[PDB]
Subunit: 233 residues, 4 copies
Amino acid sequence: GSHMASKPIEDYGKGKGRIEPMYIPDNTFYNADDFLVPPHCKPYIDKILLPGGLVKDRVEKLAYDIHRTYFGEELHIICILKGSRGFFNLLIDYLATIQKYSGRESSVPPFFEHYVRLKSYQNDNSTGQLTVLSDDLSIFRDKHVLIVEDIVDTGFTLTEFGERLKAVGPKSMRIATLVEKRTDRSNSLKGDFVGFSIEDVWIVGCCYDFNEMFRDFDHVAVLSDAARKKFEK
Amino acid sequence: GSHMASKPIEDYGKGKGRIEPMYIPDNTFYNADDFLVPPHCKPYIDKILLPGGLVKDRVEKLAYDIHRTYFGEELHIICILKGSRGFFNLLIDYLATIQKYSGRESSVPPFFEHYVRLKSYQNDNSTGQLTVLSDDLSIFRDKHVLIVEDIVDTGFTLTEFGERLKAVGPKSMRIATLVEKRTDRSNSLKGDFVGFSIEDVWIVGCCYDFNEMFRDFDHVAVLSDAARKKFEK
Amino acid sequence: GSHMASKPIEDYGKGKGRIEPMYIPDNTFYNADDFLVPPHCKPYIDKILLPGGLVKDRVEKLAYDIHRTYFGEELHIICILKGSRGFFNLLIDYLATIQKYSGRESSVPPFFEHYVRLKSYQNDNSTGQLTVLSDDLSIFRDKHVLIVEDIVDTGFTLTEFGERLKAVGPKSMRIATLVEKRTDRSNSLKGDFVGFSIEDVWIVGCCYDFNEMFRDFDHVAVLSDAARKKFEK
Amino acid sequence: GSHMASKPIEDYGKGKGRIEPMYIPDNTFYNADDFLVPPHCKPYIDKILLPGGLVKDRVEKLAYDIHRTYFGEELHIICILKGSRGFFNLLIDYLATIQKYSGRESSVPPFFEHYVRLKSYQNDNSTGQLTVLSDDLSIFRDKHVLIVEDIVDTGFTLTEFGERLKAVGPKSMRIATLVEKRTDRSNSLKGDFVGFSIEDVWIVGCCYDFNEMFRDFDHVAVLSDAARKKFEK
Ligand SMILES: O=P(O)(O)OC[C@H]1O[C@H](OP(=O)(O)OP(=O)(O)O)[C@H](O)[C@@H]1O
Ligand SMILES: O=P(O)(O)OC[C@H]1O[C@H](OP(=O)(O)OP(=O)(O)O)[C@H](O)[C@@H]1O
Ligand SMILES: O=P(O)(O)OC[C@H]1O[C@H](OP(=O)(O)OP(=O)(O)O)[C@H](O)[C@@H]1O
Ligand SMILES: O=P(O)(O)OC[C@H]1O[C@H](OP(=O)(O)OP(=O)(O)O)[C@H](O)[C@@H]1O
Ligand SMILES: Nc1nc2cc[nH]c2c(=O)[nH]1
Ligand SMILES: Nc1nc2cc[nH]c2c(=O)[nH]1
Ligand SMILES: Nc1nc2cc[nH]c2c(=O)[nH]1
Ligand SMILES: Nc1nc2cc[nH]c2c(=O)[nH]1
Ligand SMILES: [Mg+2]
Ligand SMILES: [Mg+2]
Ligand SMILES: [Mg+2]
Ligand SMILES: [Mg+2]
Ligand SMILES: [Mg+2]
Ligand SMILES: [Mg+2]
Ligand SMILES: [Mg+2]
Ligand SMILES: [Mg+2]
């Protein structure tokens, strides 16, 4: 163990000491027509915010940042379902590979995986209620916990779930989020390992859904008017 | 829709009309020393049953078999956590890629993903009780459902969970399991899309755990005496 | 197929009827500090023009465009060494996967590979003399030929080699190039399947070298002053 | 590093001090029907010797063995075209990733790539004459050289090319070969980094060709009678 892994519980969600994310300036997009877009997505995707390959490149760096923080530590990593599935899978592949090739050796696994299903949204609006599905959280007492999320927008999801975790007394709590949105709807909760800062637009693709649609598309796009009209409920 | 996707609910778990899996004969192993084994696994892994790359090659074929069964269908695919995470992630990458490259076009996504956490084992013994954590299963009424699992051994997990699903009235129910074990402990439930048939040995690695250990190792190995002694509880 | 693959030899280098590439506007760069940069490159890489994953995403679309041109027909694809190694390898992986998953019958392989080593540059200047190392080019008589290149800049390399190939009487000749540079140094030769249009800057990384340095870096960067000073000859 | 990389030139082809390869016993084959086989290969492929994913898993370990030999030292790696393309590309990807994640400082790249085209075979018989296409080999004077090959069978190709390289005075010469065949036709030349030892059968697939056919198939198979009849010349 190293003091590098420590973090006060009161610092949860404050982003203290973080490396700032890649900042995608307002109105910065690629054209969907430059990518292969499958037939079920073609009528609906016009603007690409984050190419899928750019996501993977950035997650490599996040994974190294995490590796450096937790080397040799027992690390309990929590996937927030459904949305973080893709980011989590990329992350844990990199974490395992980095450790496998590291000259410095650890007798501890690179992580221990866990799953929690949270749900807030219908269309692009929160219901105001958080659904929480988890194993008994008491297993996280005195553990170093890393929550893995796809996006932080208002902060409601991770503020609420964070209080449930604090109640069992973890040793440390950090957040990895692929995206953080720039919005006056945010309650100021922010991640520790953040891929990208983006403008206030509703993203779809690469696990980002609109009523369960678009998760399998390879790229992070914006929700178009055609997509909203077809898939809203 | 095609009648190819239909299957009577009473045929659930009977493997009727299936393509038989690759049969790994008794006492067929590779040597761990021919692979790169990370330090946290090195004292514990001696025999490799399924190289990680062999798993990936076989999942390609399973994915095509599934694609052919469900082309153009609304397909609700359920990941059984924790163990099926790796197989599920490989599978859905192939399903999406196959559909993206297919000359024949579908306006339906290749799948709709879902997660259910089931738990039966402690060490290598069932507790006799099944833990079930899920969203409301009523969403599967009148749906084509494909359950994705890492292994079927006794059949207890999928027999019990299968009855919960039958109660909401799905349209069809199939099972994809990477491995099926040859054992007189089986209740005869078997999968529809099965990767490998293996002898009666306790496997670890490639998401197969022993008390949460070995999931990140790249290859499917057997549980050694050293591993049991170190990690049993 | 022949209706799609046919093209007059005199159209070689005109990019006649092409799909225009992704256009990267002047002065558009990512910051190296947002990516993982290995120690041998760290002192030298500051500006990232094309993330390696964006390269891969674009190559998928090029490969689809090429599949649509040649499916069902013998395709003889020529890798221009050394620089095109990485693009060629990505391209042929996609071509094979696309045809494999297309669901369309063909007894013809997705490509037949060939290799030619061409050399023009020392530092960032042409010597004026093209080195040509090849098997007997007579094997391309009456064949559909696709030349695969990493970059077209002045056009010298592919104008000179193009003339040697015309002399053996191919059925068609096209160019795939990952990058085309916007430069007044160009003789107006341009590709048929082009990944990216970029400003007049000397790129390194992702197989783009400066005196054999930087090929293994994952991303396409600009040649910095430090890099020039250290590695010029 | 020099203590590890040094080796007498006279030990070339002896495999002196090597790690023995994975041993595939006589008559050990998987069934093609358990894999996805593309339409152009379906009539011809029946027995799978080495699944493509098993190839990849073994190459990771070879790459680690090579990293341990050359880290910190200039390594000049020579791809023998055409056959070694796929092995070479896997190997250099691993070498770069290993060094990148090692956490060890080095200003030296993981390798410097080079290409030589050698040709001996027509059908499954040598013509007796070796075609050699290369840049000036004088650039290897006083360098650590690693030759990368897909298979060593009779030893003719690498015995003849080995003599040309000795004439320019390299610092060291080693061989990486994915496969070595057990055959009384061998002149006893053997590799230093060898993936697999196999019985005396003619392999195709995974870059192994018969008159330029089968390179793009993903798996290493045996040449069937149907394949021989259709593609022999
Ligand atoms: O910061 P917030 O404003 O709370 O929003 C972010 C959260 O909302 C989304 O989940 P959603 O509720 O859509 O469930 P899903 O992950 O299953 O899509 C997203 O995946 C985050 O979990
Ligand atoms: O056919 P059975 O005898 O019921 O055994 C198979 C099930 O047991 C294991 O899960 P486990 O309970 O270990 O939970 P896990 O998936 O979280 O490891 C395995 O992953 C299957 O889900
Ligand atoms: O359009 P042009 O101005 O002729 O320049 C482009 C060519 O030059 C570079 O090759 P180089 O001569 O550097 O050899 P390499 O491919 O081995 O790096 C590059 O890879 C192209 O082949
Ligand atoms: O040990 P040996 O009996 O000499 O045989 C091995 C060599 O022969 C094959 O090359 P081939 O001549 O078929 O050319 P290719 O690499 O272009 O297929 C193979 O790729 C090796 O290079
Ligand atoms: N898909 C998607 N989910 C969420 C949840 C909060 N913000 C977003 C967003 O922009 N996109
Ligand atoms: N890891 C692991 N889990 C299970 C659950 C049932 N059988 C097995 C097995 O062989 N291995
Ligand atoms: N690496 C590299 N090679 C070439 C050859 C022509 N232009 C370029 C360039 O910008 N970069
Ligand atoms: N494809 C192929 N090439 C060679 C060259 C020597 N032996 C072999 C072999 O078994 N297969
Ligand atoms: Mg979510
Ligand atoms: Mg959502
Ligand atoms: Mg399980
Ligand atoms: Mg388990
Ligand atoms: Mg070049
Ligand atoms: Mg060059
Ligand atoms: Mg060869
Ligand atoms: Mg050959």
